[PDB]
Amino acid sequence: FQGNKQWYLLANQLILSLSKYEGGHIFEKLVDCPDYYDVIKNPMSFSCIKTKLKKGQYAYPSEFVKDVQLIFDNCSLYNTSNSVVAITGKNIETYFNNQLIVMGYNNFILKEKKINDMLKLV
């Protein structure tokens, strides 16, 4: 078949739809003696994810999803639940998770975990 090209092309169509979605521009780029509590353990942005896709750095479909989910986990961590940015973040997160169902991206993650668990047992 095509190996990993099909899920790469869906991942690229999926990161472009997040950038275009309402308030997605807030997560496009990284915000440039910092306060200890403001230090981000794993920074992430849509531009970083696009660069990994262009460079071919993802080895599995789940790796793209974990980087996208990292943006939304950071958003809810560094912003109050009742703030404009935290509400925007929960909306794009719901959009992303529903797009994984509509685009059929979750079938690649299911096919990924079926092969990985099989190789270890057999």
Domain assignments of the chain as residue spans, ordered by start: 1-122
Q: Find, among 23, 2, 8, the residue nearest to 65 by Cα.
A: 8
CATH assignment, 1-122: 1.20.920.10
Asked if 43 contacts 74 with a C-beta cutoff of 8 angstroms, the reply is yes
Please enumerate, as own/partner, the contacts of 84-92 that have beta carbons within 8 Å and a separation of 24 or more: 85/26, 88/22, 88/23, 88/26, 89/26, 89/27, 91/22, 91/23, 92/18, 92/21, 92/23, 92/24, 92/27
The approach used to solve this structure was: X-ray
What residue type is assigned to position 92 of the chain? I
Question: 100 to each of 12, 56, 64, 95, 107, how far by Cα in Å?
Answer: 12, 20, 12, 9, 9
Give the dihedral of Cα atoms 78, 84, 86, 91; nearest 10 deg.
Answer: -160
Helix, strand, or coil (residue 104): coil
Structure-block tokens of residue 17: 């739809």
For the CA atoms of the chain, what is the radius of gyration? 16
Query: Any idea what the Cα angle at residue 74 is, between residues 69 and 55, rounded to 5°?
Result: 55
- 61 φ, ψ to 5°? -55, -35
Let me know the angle formed at the C-alpha of 76 by 74 and 81, rounded to the nearest 5 degrees.
160
CA separation for the pair 88, 79 (Å, rounded):
11
